[PDB]
Write a protein that binds this ligand. Structure first.
Ligand SMILES: *[C@@H]1O[C@H](CO)[C@@H](O[C@@H]2O[C@H](CO)[C@@H](O)[C@H](O)[C@H]2NC(C)=O)[C@H](O)[C@H]1NC(C)=O
Ligand SMILES: *[C@@H]1O[C@H](CO)[C@@H](O[C@@H]2O[C@H](CO)[C@@H](O)[C@H](O)[C@H]2NC(C)=O)[C@H](O)[C@H]1NC(C)=O
Lengths: 50, 50
């Protein structure tokens, strides 16, 4: 299929109307970030020649 | 098949036709002794950085 970007949401804009929140949600989200790699050492003489 | 390694007793039960043993990286880590029908693990000789 041809992918859809997102659901369409036409915001009801007018020159004298505002939307004010009456409530709130305390939302906890996860962010995973790599920090380090495996520290690998290669003996060049032993690798090439044994 | 020549090489240099420590030959220890093995817990791998070989099939009667198989003689050699390889790990993931295609290196021979197990062998069957031709004189006595027993299985030996080859651990590589101790090495490390100084
Ligand atoms: C604020 O008012 C606007 C206009 O009356 C609302 O917008 C309409 O909402 C209905 C409800 O589903 C939709 O069917 C219409 O298509 C919307 N019109 C437009 C131009 O967007 C809006 O929902 C109201 N907001 C609140 C929080 O009550
Ligand atoms: C704001 O939203 C919260 C939801 O997070 C509402 O809390 C709920 O209230 C109902 C009715 O009192 C309870 O049955 C739910 O168990 C409540 N949820 C939680 C998570 O406590 C709160 O009442 C809303 N406030 C307003 C003014 O709309």
């Amino acid at each position: 299929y041809t992918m859809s970007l997102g659901a369409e949401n036409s915001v009801a804009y007018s020159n004298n109307s505002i939307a004010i929140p009456t409530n709130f949600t305390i939302s906890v989200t996860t962010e995973i970030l790599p920090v380090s790699m495996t520290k690998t050492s290669v003996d060049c003489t032993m690798y090439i020649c044994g | 098949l020549t090489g240099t390694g420590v030959l220890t007793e093995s817990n791998k039960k070989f099939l009667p036709f198989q003689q050699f043993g390889r790990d993931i990286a295609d290196t021979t880590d197990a062998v069957r002794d031709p004189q006595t029908l027993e299985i030996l693990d080859i651990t590589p000789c101790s090495f490390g950085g100084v």
